[PDB]
Subunit: 80 residues, 3 copies
């Protein structure tokens, strides 16, 4: 009923994003990336992940039945 | 030439948002929500209100000739 | 192969924005506005400038072969 997605989150230069939130859709099922930018989450194969971290644009990525995902976060384009 | 709109502003859990700005369109006619999430503003019946508060997505809501309005603010999806 | 664009950056009231970033597209070719809101940048005539400054919405403006440009920045509509 789920698959286990193992993912890697980087910035545009390919450096790991450490501590990014990775949540299944808008549910309470979520995790954080580790010291290497890696996460593991059990999700529906047809779901989408929301990835966020301070200083970056939040992104929604479709799982598309993939057990391995790479997410490249882009920096925010404003500050206060 | 106006109506008086009495409104209630909440977050997604239904708790009042206290101190939110409620402005007629982009004009200088504005107020703030009280301790109970309530506001009163005199506006054109055909106008729209802009509702904002720190930490939430600004929203525009059509008055649609209504003298009683509920606004549900959603949290921002980034931070810095 | 380039033109020199001389530009003036203001807020909605017409006051200079001092220290705004002015970058050719998403490249490393960039400058900042001076004490009078003015910048000079050498760019492709067919390019676009990205103008940003704390507290304002980032804007992209086409050069359109113009050697003189005015940019009016609008304030951000949220804060944290
Ligand atoms: Ni922000």
């Amino acid at each position: 009923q789920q698959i286990t997605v193992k993912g890697h989150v980087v910035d545009a230069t390919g450096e790991p994003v450490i501590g990014a939130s990775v949540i299944e859709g808008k549910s309470t099922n979520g995790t954080i990336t580790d010291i290497d930018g890696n996460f593991s989450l059990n999700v529906s194969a047809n779901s989408a992940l929301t990835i966020s971290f301070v200083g970056y644009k939040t992104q929604t990525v479709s799982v598309n039945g993939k057990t391995a995902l790479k997410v490249t976060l882009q920096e925010l384009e404003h500050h206060h």
